[PDB]
Amino acid sequence: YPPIKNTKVGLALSSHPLASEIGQKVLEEGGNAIDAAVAIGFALAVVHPAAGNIGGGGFAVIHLANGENVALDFREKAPLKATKNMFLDKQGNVVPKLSEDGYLAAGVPGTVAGMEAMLKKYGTKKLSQLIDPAIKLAENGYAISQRQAETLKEARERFLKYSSSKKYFFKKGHLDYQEGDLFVQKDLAKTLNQIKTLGAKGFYQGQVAELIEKDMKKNGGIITKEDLASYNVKWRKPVVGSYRGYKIISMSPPSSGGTHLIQILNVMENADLSALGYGASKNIHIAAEAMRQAYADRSVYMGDADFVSVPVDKLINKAYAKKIFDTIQPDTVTPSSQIKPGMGQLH
């Protein structure tokens, strides 16, 4: 139960021991939270391939020593050739797994751009140094954990469909990796070294960009050098809220999380949850009904704010939350079928 503790350099926590240690060591060596975050970002792209990555994207919410709160959007972008019904057959019907497995299901990767973006703006150490640990792990390998042997096995069927993956995630003869096996990733190392040397350009340009485009074209994908060269992170303002005297700073669009998190919290704030304590059906009911309305709202008002109008300010307005709370009945629920996005309000 006892939480991890530190009273000197702070904490750097991730879902993988090697990556967390790598980040912690950056803190011990003098780097700041950003330096450590960038170091962790690349480490996880090596030791936790199921999620950690350089081929995906994500978000970063940051509180700076000077009191400023910023959000970094390095989410993937639909390719330049992507279309509204690109995953439907010639009858408007969803083409099975076309948006789940394969090269066409991929958006332009932003992770690498994101790491360099936050480093250049708020970091203090050089990328070349913060990326060395991951490079070492990719070059010399690491032990396949118990959980990894599993997840890797549950994804075997998918890997098999693609030669590229068959070569990187299987031992000779396309055999699954077992717990304890030493997993080495030479090509990933090369790519990482490219970034270490040329920075983000080592990924979105040159050989790596070449490999991406040619392999994409060769496999029915649509990502091209044009896409990579045009990928751009976006520093956005975080969505902000308050909860019983605490300031909530979370991710704004293209993420819906921060908005609905603050929305639901706003509804719950109208009740004294502390009174009945954790796990009381009375408190769970209030939170669940708030969630119910928020997810309904999500299905209609949420999208990339750069392309559509998203009523963030309205959804996080406490008056709107108060209107939701007042509809919550003490011992009965509001069926989802009777829920109406926006409640009719939002105007």
């Binding site: 299901a105 030479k186 769970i284 119910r292 559509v308 989802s336």
Partner: protein
């Protein structure tokens, strides 16, 4: 998806959630580069009313367009108190991310749990569609389930939700104390 939190001695805090979407993303790699490609496009509404990998639906707001970024549920978050770092939290889990993060925060602020307790605590989930109250194994006793079922909820026990990596900072007489917690779920 995976999330990591960082906080230093200078007062900086970074909350990062990134992913390739599903486990191992699209399962396809870039030959010669050695990295897996994401299948983030599935976070787009590829057809009105069509539920994606997490049961989420959409209309026009989240339809596909060139260079548009697909809607996400990732909720990297930082909670402040007197403009100082108090909590750095986030988590993976598709649609359940929002509710998972929300519960950890509520656990600390509403029930005064330390970050470890807040993270370990059983979690529930409601996402409108499907119209069910998702819970975890051993997470809710009979008495509670009975009362919720009487209210109209359709309770279903499913795999544990999330993998929260959080940090709680508390002001010390001379400096600050950092408390952290990894999720016993994964």
């Amino acid at each position: 998806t995976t999330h990591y939190s960082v906080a230093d001695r200078w007062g900086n805090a970074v909350s990062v959630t990134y992913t390739i979407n599903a486990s191992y993303g699209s399962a396809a790699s870039i030959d010669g580069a050695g990295f897996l490609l994401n299948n983030e496009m599935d976070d787009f509404s590829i057809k009105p009313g069509n539920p994606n990998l997490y049961g989420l639906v959409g209309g026009d707001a989240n339809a596909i367009e060139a260079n548009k970024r697909p809607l996400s549920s990732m909720s990297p978050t930082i909670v402040l108190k007197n403009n100082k770092v108090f909590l750095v939290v986030g988590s993976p889990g598709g649609s359940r991310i929002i509710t998972t993060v929300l519960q950890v925060i509520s656990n600390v602020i509403d029930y005064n749990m330390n970050i470890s307790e807040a993270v370990s605590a059983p979690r529930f989930h409601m996402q409108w569609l499907p119209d069910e109250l998702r819970i975890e194994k051993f997470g809710m006793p009979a008495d509670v389930k009975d009362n919720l079922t009487k209210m109209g909820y359709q309770i279903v026990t499913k795999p544990v939700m999330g993998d929260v990596n959080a940090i709680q900072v508390l002001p010390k007489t001379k400096g600050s104390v950092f408390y952290g917690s990894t999720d016993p779920r994964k």
